[PDB]
Design an enzyme around this catalytic site. Sequence first.
Site, mmCIF file in Angstrom:
data_model
loop_
_atom_site.group_PDB
_atom_site.id
_atom_site.type_symbol
_atom_site.label_atom_id
_atom_site.label_comp_id
_atom_site.label_asym_id
_atom_site.label_seq_id
_atom_site.Cartn_x
_atom_site.Cartn_y
_atom_site.Cartn_z
ATOM 1 C CG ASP A 189 -1.834 1.239 1.262
ATOM 2 O OD1 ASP A 189 -1.907 1.998 0.268
ATOM 3 O OD2 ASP A 189 -2.468 1.453 2.318
ATOM 4 C CG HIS A 345 5.991 2.897 3.198
ATOM 5 N ND1 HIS A 345 6.483 1.931 2.344
ATOM 6 C CD2 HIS A 345 4.739 2.502 3.533
ATOM 7 C CE1 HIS A 345 5.573 0.987 2.185
ATOM 8 N NE2 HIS A 345 4.503 1.310 2.890
ATOM 9 C CG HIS A 379 4.862 -3.377 4.451
ATOM 10 N ND1 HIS A 379 4.563 -3.804 5.726
ATOM 11 C CD2 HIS A 379 3.968 -2.405 4.159
ATOM 12 C CE1 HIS A 379 3.533 -3.116 6.187
ATOM 13 N NE2 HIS A 379 3.152 -2.264 5.254
ATOM 14 C CD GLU A 404 1.256 -5.511 1.169
ATOM 15 O OE1 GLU A 404 2.203 -4.919 1.730
ATOM 16 O OE2 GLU A 404 0.079 -5.092 1.190
ATOM 17 C CG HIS A 406 -3.300 -6.451 0.735
ATOM 18 N ND1 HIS A 406 -3.239 -5.237 1.380
ATOM 19 C CD2 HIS A 406 -4.386 -7.091 1.232
ATOM 20 C CE1 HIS A 406 -4.259 -5.136 2.214
ATOM 21 N NE2 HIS A 406 -4.967 -6.250 2.149
ATOM 22 C CD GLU A 449 -2.104 -5.570 4.629
ATOM 23 O OE1 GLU A 449 -1.680 -4.604 3.951
ATOM 24 O OE2 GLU A 449 -3.263 -5.612 5.080
ATOM 25 C CD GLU A 525 0.441 -2.206 9.057
ATOM 26 O OE1 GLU A 525 1.092 -2.976 8.317
ATOM 27 O OE2 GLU A 525 -0.657 -1.710 8.719
ATOM 28 C CG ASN A 585 -7.132 7.169 -7.667
ATOM 29 O OD1 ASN A 585 -7.482 7.727 -6.632
ATOM 30 N ND2 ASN A 585 -7.682 7.432 -8.842
ATOM 31 C CG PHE A 589 -7.272 5.272 2.154
ATOM 32 C CD1 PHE A 589 -8.454 5.705 1.564
ATOM 33 C CD2 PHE A 589 -7.304 4.789 3.456
ATOM 34 C CE1 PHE A 589 -9.655 5.646 2.260
ATOM 35 C CE2 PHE A 589 -8.495 4.728 4.161
ATOM 36 C CZ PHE A 589 -9.680 5.155 3.562
ATOM 37 C CG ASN A 592 -2.273 6.025 5.727
ATOM 38 O OD1 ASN A 592 -1.614 5.190 5.113
ATOM 39 N ND2 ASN A 592 -3.439 6.499 5.274
ATOM 40 C CD1 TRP A 987 -11.088 -0.995 7.378
ATOM 41 C CD2 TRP A 987 -9.357 0.422 7.405
ATOM 42 N NE1 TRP A 987 -10.046 -1.623 8.032
ATOM 43 C CE2 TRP A 987 -8.972 -0.777 8.060
ATOM 44 C CE3 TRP A 987 -8.427 1.466 7.294
ATOM 45 C CZ2 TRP A 987 -7.700 -0.963 8.598
ATOM 46 C CZ3 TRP A 987 -7.159 1.289 7.840
ATOM 47 C CH2 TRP A 987 -6.807 0.078 8.481
#
Lengths: 1011, 1011
Positions: A189, A345, A379, A404, A406, A449, A525, A585, A589, A592, A987
């Site tokens: 993400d 990140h 990640h 990942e 996901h 994930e 997280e 997209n 999000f 964060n 969410w």
Amino acid sequence: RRDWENPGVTQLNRLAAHPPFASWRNSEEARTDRPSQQLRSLNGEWRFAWFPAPEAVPESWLECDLPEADTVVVPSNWQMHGYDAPIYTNVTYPITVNPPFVPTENPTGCYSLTFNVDESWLQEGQTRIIFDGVNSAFHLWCNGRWVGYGQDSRLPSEFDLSAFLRAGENRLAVMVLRWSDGSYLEDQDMWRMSGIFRDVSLLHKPTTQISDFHVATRFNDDFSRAVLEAEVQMCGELRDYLRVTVSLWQGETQVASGTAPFGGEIIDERGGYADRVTLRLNVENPKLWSAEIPNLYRAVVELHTADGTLIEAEACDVGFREVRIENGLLLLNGKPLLIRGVNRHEHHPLHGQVMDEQTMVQDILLMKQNNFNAVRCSHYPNHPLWYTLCDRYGLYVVDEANIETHGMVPMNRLTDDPRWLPAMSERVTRMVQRDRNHPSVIIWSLGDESGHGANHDALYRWIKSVDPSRPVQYEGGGADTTATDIICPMYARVDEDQPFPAVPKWSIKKWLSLPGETRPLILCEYAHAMGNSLGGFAKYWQAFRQYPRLQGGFVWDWVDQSLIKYDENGNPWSAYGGDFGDTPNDRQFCMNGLVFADRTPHPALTEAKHQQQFFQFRLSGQTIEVTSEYLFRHSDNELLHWMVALDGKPLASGEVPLDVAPQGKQLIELPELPQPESAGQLWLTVRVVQPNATAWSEAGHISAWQQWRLAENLSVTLPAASHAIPHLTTSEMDFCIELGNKRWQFNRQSGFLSQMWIGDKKQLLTPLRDQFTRAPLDNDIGVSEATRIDPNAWVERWKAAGHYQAEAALLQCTADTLADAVLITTAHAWQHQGKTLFISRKTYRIDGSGQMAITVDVEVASDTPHPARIGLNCQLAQVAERVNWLGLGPQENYPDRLTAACFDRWDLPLSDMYTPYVFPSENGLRCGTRELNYGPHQWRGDFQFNISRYSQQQLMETSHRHLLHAEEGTWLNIDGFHMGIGGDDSWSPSVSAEFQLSAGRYHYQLVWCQK
Amino acid sequence: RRDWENPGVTQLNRLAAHPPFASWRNSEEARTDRPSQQLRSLNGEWRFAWFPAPEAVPESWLECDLPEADTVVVPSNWQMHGYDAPIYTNVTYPITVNPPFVPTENPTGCYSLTFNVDESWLQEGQTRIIFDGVNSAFHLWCNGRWVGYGQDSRLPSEFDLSAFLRAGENRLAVMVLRWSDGSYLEDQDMWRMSGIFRDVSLLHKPTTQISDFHVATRFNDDFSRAVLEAEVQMCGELRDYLRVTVSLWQGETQVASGTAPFGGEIIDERGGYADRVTLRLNVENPKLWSAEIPNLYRAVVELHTADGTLIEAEACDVGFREVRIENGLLLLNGKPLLIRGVNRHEHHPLHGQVMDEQTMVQDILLMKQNNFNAVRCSHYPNHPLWYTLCDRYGLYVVDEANIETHGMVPMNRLTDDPRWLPAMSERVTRMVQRDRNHPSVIIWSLGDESGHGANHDALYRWIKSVDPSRPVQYEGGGADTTATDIICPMYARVDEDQPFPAVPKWSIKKWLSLPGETRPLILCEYAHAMGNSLGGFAKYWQAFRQYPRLQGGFVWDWVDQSLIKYDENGNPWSAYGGDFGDTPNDRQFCMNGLVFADRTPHPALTEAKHQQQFFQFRLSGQTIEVTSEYLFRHSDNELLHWMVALDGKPLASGEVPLDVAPQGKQLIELPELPQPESAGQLWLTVRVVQPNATAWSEAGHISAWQQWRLAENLSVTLPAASHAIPHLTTSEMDFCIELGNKRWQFNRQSGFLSQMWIGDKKQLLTPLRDQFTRAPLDNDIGVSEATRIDPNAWVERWKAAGHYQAEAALLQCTADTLADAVLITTAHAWQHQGKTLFISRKTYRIDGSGQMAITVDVEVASDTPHPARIGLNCQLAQVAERVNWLGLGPQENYPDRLTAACFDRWDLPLSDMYTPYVFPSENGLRCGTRELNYGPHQWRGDFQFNISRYSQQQLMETSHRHLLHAEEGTWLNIDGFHMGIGGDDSWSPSVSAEFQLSAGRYHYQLVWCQK
Ligand SMILES: [Mg+2]
Ligand SMILES: [Mg+2]
Ligand SMILES: [Mg+2]
Ligand code: NA
Ligand code: NA
Ligand code: NA
Ligand code: NA
Ligand code: NA
């Protein structure tokens, strides 16, 4: 052959991974970590060319430079140069899910470089090239001949070039593909970008070379004796004269040293490793490494002829520390950790995913400044410099593989498929082979994930077998699988169970004690800091501290993932998903973070600091009890500063040295306080100040604070009886009250205070009306879009019930003249589809002293979604410079995020009361306020308020912060009551019940006047 | 691209691995296991040409058949057609240890085929090709076009041909490389061959297909209730109308059925597997599968539409069984196993490593006829039919991965290398995917002789995670690593420790109780049956039976790996290493079977059959107690035959049926014992017999036997005093005796009986000289050869002491006259380099009856190696038809290999007294003999003996049986004493202290007479 579409092939002719080398030839340069002439950088100006797909690269490009090529900065991301669009998508793959195939239109980037190689380099010894980070897979040529291929965007790819290069002028050609079978395991993400984005370098090793080394440190029971154990591996022809010496240094003293020839111990029926040797150095009273005191010894690995000729020296920083899980706790050097962590990140607003020292350091100092002691590599494995800084500055790091998956259905579809065990193993082994001698890495992670699949089990065991010094965690498959030593859920709430099928996020307190459960839990997280967030943060830390086995978590996350765009004028602004023609997209999000991409901090960052404090405080009469939450260090850079104030007025203050042992206590007696004579509440406020500068903080740094209420004497003495009596003048349309040069007007057809005059100048632009809504925060909104509604979102429930289109309805407007005041009485109803949502019952009282007393009692329909606020707004004409208030500050606070704010007399510029979230929402509230001053006006009461040039209406309408325009006048919201902001996740509704406005009936009172 | 030299590439375009398919389109054909139209064998006459290197293969072979190519049979090894040499090498690689490279001279086989295909296969569906075994790597073309690439010689490679198939004539082209990077994982102790050696076929699937299915069976506490769980997976287009039905058959009776739509349970956050479904069938009181009773159910998996149309069906055999390790025991159906097992290599003396049904069935019967219940696929997964035969006849199977790195230094160099984990993981995982549904597979093995590395750890955990229903084992790195659930050493002796560094082989009894140890022990190999061997076998089985956690082992091994060669007169003979011009070679070491290559047993087989019986016997007075060792079955096919005999003469016998429950006792009382007239020893015998034929044995099969000494009547009566007197006639040169037509001649210089006479017929050729040596056995030699001598070897000890060439040095030769007889008294001494090895003292006595009573007394220097035998030899003139002996047999027995033998009168042809080991040695010994008739002769006493046309000279000098030639007359060895044959292993002295001749002084008397 289509290697980028084949998970069987992740590399071709790539050399074995290993810890960082420089191939020093002077042992002293190695010791001091000075640059080595055998480690060249090739970062700088290169020749770039974009193509729509690999099939479309001219065959001449391999031999001669392209005329249409550009000169560009390497390392970089070609999106950050504008060649194509970066894509922001969270879960869904930016590609058609069709493993292992990728789009045919495969943005291809053609980098080349003409560089010079000295003759010496080629006469004897191995010359290799090191691509620290290439996204996501690439081919390599040197002078037209094919060299190799490589995948994995986040680990170095090395290639032996001895046989390809010539003296002097050489030419590289690097065919970087955006899409590859690699991408299926790289679905994080974050912004999808590509290219050669980390360092490129050339490494000259000797032919007889150090090929690998592992540093291990084990201890006795009280960490007073240690054995350092270094295993060395070589390549070249084995000779009896060969030796390795390992020597350990503390600064410039050599504390221990070992010399031996090659030939390891007997391992099996065929014997031992002829080409390995293991050194064991005894070390009495070692200085231990921790985030508190990051002590570092230096190891020098010399390969040399016995007779004394150095062949090459390699080296590393060593930190003597022990990580283990015993009896359900995570111990470091014997002791139980408390992980005050952040997910970070690798992101830059201008540079994209290209990391530099200046930013990494800026990040670390702020992290350590705001009370963090740990960071998860979410990640993927980071730029190599990053671990070095963590080694030196002091941080616990979780090193996580670039895996990942996901977007898969189900999420384990690749991780349970044995044919993907080769590509997954490479992403775990090569990380471990690269980072395993960094002290700052205490926890190994299996990625993110990607479900739970037998592959996770296989690789988990591989690490455990290869490296027992660090525990292995992985959240996938429900956070407590057989592939994790630590329960490490994401967004599991403190008290509330979210019993999802197969993968339930139990409450943390509850999870620990599940039948047969014993493991420690440290969230990978938590507290989703998206926009106005971190409501509920204190709830975790109260819990963390109460439960031994709850050993902290890692916030999501550190830095907002915004990018800079420029407008028609050349003015810069902050962009999020969708702002690039990128479709689909996940819009905002990507943001964060606790800080903005430029590193200016969200207000959320203060709460984190205050909660992550290393000192706790109790008060008992005239005694402060200071407790240390440090495991190793004393308080050798701390003084305690206290202050007593009667409503913002300083009465006394002192200073007492803090001499607290790790985990110890200090009792501090305050002088007998002067007992004040005038009415009000006292507030004691302790601050911990670091008198001395440090590597990570300035002199005077405040690392901790706390407030208490002391004695309060309530005002019993009356206001002076003002002789003058205000005049009521009743008209057809207005109850107009007057006093001196002061004037009130009450529109009788709307029932609100529609104007005021001071002298004869108009004071209002919009009438003073109630408000039960707010411009929705990200947590109010969640996944809800115009085309895919989430009817369970706070915003969407508020819309459905009619809160935002609720029209007022006049029920009562009466005037009464009293002995010494005029009384206005209003009653209102808000209605949507024949449904009374709220009812507001008011009384205004204007006396001879010119002080308007408002009284508001509101009814809220028990079955309408609990309201966002219960208060009033108006649009003053006034635009002043300063906001002065007696209340919680100095920064923005809300009911569920207000622990770090202090009660006091604050004073700030008007623009400081606006909080510039990229996605505009309600913002800038300060709760617990008893007095607000803004120019001529004063308000007293017990309220929450914000003040800005932005209507809630404009806020909710505008999509980006830069598109906001300062409206005329100043908009003021004075809430009696305000819903929490939540943010456990973002969410699903996350505002805890005791923070929602459900009382049914509310009452608040304001005195409004001019000074 | 050189893929045969790259361990990062193990296949290209290879379809996934799966249980055995048939794509039945008729459920009844599926149920009954009949042929399916949809599966064509392409076994037959193929075209083949051989090349020295892949680079020498012309490009015209891809489109057209090479005229020079021969038409050959497939499946086959091209060695067995004699295109190049087969290489036997034990440990050392057949190539240079140079990972990843193989030689540039790489034998390359170009196979091809012209075939025709059904119109409907061209019309629709998936058509794949399935090469069951290609050794070692290959590239595949169809119709000129390149399809894919394959590695791992012992699992099937599958590729999709649909997009390649054309109308009419199609052409395959399979390029087979003998050596590849794959060769480095295939270093088994066996012949080194290559080619397409297993089945090649075509499978035609529907597009919407069953791609996988898993059959699991769990149980309750008493196995009275069982669930069958069947996970079914598909490929293609899912549609709401698809269904799967899993039905379970027992004979012609459905027992339970499960029908449902695709859609599995929620797995993780993202959902479940829509392309899968899991059927649960409840089965009450199931018939369980065991080797004792191979109860099989049939499972049919139908992919069909809800409206009732079948798309396809797959099926398997199901045996309800649970295998767990609990409280340190390997339990099968909750009962502890006793593994009566053997290692079995896929071998044929004509066909190499090609397998067939007739051979397998032969092997399976023999093993079960000789009391075996388990087998190890040493050391690769077997031809697929093998598991089916095992499921049906009933054998416990260890399925073993195709990974062996015996030749690496150290053995783990590859298995600890993460670059090799992908290549390794494929070999392990793909065995399971293929073989997981066979009831007969009870244990997964991680490979063989490859040390211990993190890769083993990683794959163990993969198997545990993927198949919790089976324990995983592995011998590597010490036989008790973190990588095995069973302590499974090779050649760990019973009582004697062998404390090797890093990898000690403890004594099995001691191993179990090593501190903190709990796991069970089963030797993955033991009792090296190489040549004359298996000595000390009974010692294992006594310990197996006493210690509950000792649960047996697998013998090394089943069949001799000799290959037929033909001579000048076109005559076959068995050949071993180096007999093909192959070098380096490990000679006769490929031959370690209990049976010869043609499946004739070595005499060691009967020992094994005896020791591995399932009924145990005790005698207490007249009461036989019969104990069953069976875990599950009653003795529903057994009757005890008992027999008493006075020195070979039947005295009485009888039958009593065994009605023994599993693990119970039957007490069979023998009738009032008939007390004998004459003088001798009564011996009880009991044979257990199966009256009814089974699927595995003929009517009359003897499954168990045992003997006992009862009453002995010592002979006391004096010789009936004859009226003849033997006359001494002394000359200068020879002491000569007469008696009627009998004449004895003792030489005075040698000091031995040089010639006997019956009339004018001389009885001897070589005089009756002593013997202290034997033609060495494979256990005597071990690893020693002429160029590298192993000084430790038994043979090298006897060679270097002089034992083999020492000469008799007469000390005395006298001849006094007795009253009724004549008495010769000799003395000899054997010397070498001034050392006295053996003094031998004899007293011949000849009375008037013709009887010659020889009395021998030997001295042995305590410091010479203990000799191989102590006895006499002579070459008899007569050549006879029969041998007749009272003593152990009928088969060859040795001091430590005679439990299986029975005391009785045996009459065999002379050639059954010679054992034709391919490597000739000491053979045909029969111990505990009291009487021995051959021709007119007779030897009485208590001795062991062998009688053949081959001298100990010829045997020790010839290296191949086929090159032996009968000698004039007959050599007789008569032994007072013989050393053990040994064989706990064949590379170190293994003869147990109690079977070494160490007393120093030895006595034994003979009586020679013409009958
Ligand atoms: Mg994700
Ligand atoms: Mg290969
Ligand atoms: Mg071997
Ligand atoms: Na805690
Ligand atoms: Na995000
Ligand atoms: Na907005
Ligand atoms: Na036992
Ligand atoms: Na062998």
